[PDB]
Design a binder for this molecule. Structure first.
Ligand SMILES: O=c1cc(O)n([C@@H]2O[C@H](COP(=O)(O)O)[C@@H](O)[C@H]2O)c(=O)[nH]1
Ligand SMILES: O=c1cc(O)n([C@@H]2O[C@H](COP(=O)(O)O)[C@@H](O)[C@H]2O)c(=O)[nH]1
Lengths: 219, 218
């Protein structure tokens, strides 16, 4: 499994190239894994992945929540890996064929798929929560090894870890700004994803170091 | 929304030169183009302004927005800054995520399309069972624009029943995926068509032919 420094993944959702680069550079000593999503990619282009790889010693997870038909999923993954992303995040709710399309490209291209099985925000309760156990089990059946589950619902996160087993790799957003607790989350997740708590802080470095100190015994 | 010939081109080619050439070849038949991540992630968001400059077409950004509300807001803002007229959003992540998109669209004078049910076989596993409830959620939220599948006309008809005749409904899956243009337009306002046109030996003749086959529905 990828070796995530300090069990901490920066969610770089600033939409300005200069700011994203400044903040990411400032926390570089604490984090070697960066999640880049559409807020930044749609603002600055896929070349932002190239610039991050040039500037920092960071793994790149493309948080694109892939959610299309299999044929379109295939193209999205091909474009994303071509640009230099190490991994891509895909939704499981569109079903098994859509997930397998992504797995097949990642296999061909030598990269990784993460499966998002359940989400951290209130709206996740309406439709996703009820499908989550089955989406997770479908992931296991398809051979998915990397997963995403919510920091804001420890009870649900614990169940996800059960389903996927101790050998699978699990990352979790929702600590900090959304109210999730880093320590409790790391009881089940391999790494926490953290965005605003860090990138909106007056001192992103101090904020990152503070999170890390709070979980020191877990490293 | 007034779509020429009830036909929306899904431009999923991933090369700028081919995308522009093929769109130019069928321009006389359409005035609405769906641009998705295959083209955008390959060529950049500047392609949206390039299409408007070359064709003056309306642009629907098919980004299947499916994140938390805060991120959805950022995605729509970036998308509309690029010149998109409309954006397609998933309903499965729930109401707050959809409302986030509605807010930005209102702020920038754009439209949100709610994808309530999909066209491919995997849609049966999780989406189909939620689809009616997602459509009702759209109605509750004041959504007026919807997306549903040409490959399942009985499901598309049910979607039309829920949203009413006043809402706008577009539908992918005709052609390559096996849907029928004429049957689909019994329920949808417009059909979305990609491969049947953009992979055809002669895209212009392909578009013309589809239109010929539905000429009585125009
Ligand atoms: O269920 C999920 C899945 C996500 O990818 N995310 C993503 O994780 C990040 C969380 O950032 P933040 O720490 O600012 O709340 C955002 O990029 C968001 O899109 C989430 O918040 N909840
Ligand atoms: O349920 C859906 C929703 C879609 O947006 N689409 C999109 O509609 C287009 C269909 O293209 P095609 O005519 O080549 O099958 C693709 O861009 C696809 O991503 C779909 O096929 N099914």
């Amino acid at each position: 499994v990828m070796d995530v420094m300090n069990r901490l993944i920066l969610a770089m959702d600033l939409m300005n190239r200069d700011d994203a680069l400044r903040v990411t550079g400032e926390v570089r000593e604490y984090i070697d894994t960066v999640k880049i999503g559409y807020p930044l990619v749609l603002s600055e282009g896929m070349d932002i992945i190239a610039e991050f790889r040039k500037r920092f010693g960071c793994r790149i997870i493309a948080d694109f929540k892939v959610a299309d038909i299999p044929e379109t999923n295939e193209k999205i993954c091909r474009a994303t890996f071509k640009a230099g992303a190490d991994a891509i995040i895909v939704h499981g709710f569109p079903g098994a064929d859509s997930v397998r399309a992504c797995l097949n490209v990642a296999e061909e291209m030598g990269r990784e798929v993460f499966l998002l099985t359940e989400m951290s925000h209130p709206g996740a309760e309406m439709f996703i929560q009820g499908a989550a156990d089955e989406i997770a089990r479908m992931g296991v059946d398809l051979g998915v090894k990397n997963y995403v589950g919510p920091s804001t619902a420890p009870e649900r996160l614990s169940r996800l870890r059960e389903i996927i087993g101790q050998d699978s790799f699990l990352i979790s957003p929702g600590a900090g700004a959304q109210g999730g607790d880093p320590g409790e989350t790391l009881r089940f997740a391999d790494a926490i994803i953290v965005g605003r708590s860090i990138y909106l802080a007056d001192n992103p470095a101090a904020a990152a170091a503070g999170i890390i100190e709070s979980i020191k015994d877990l490293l």
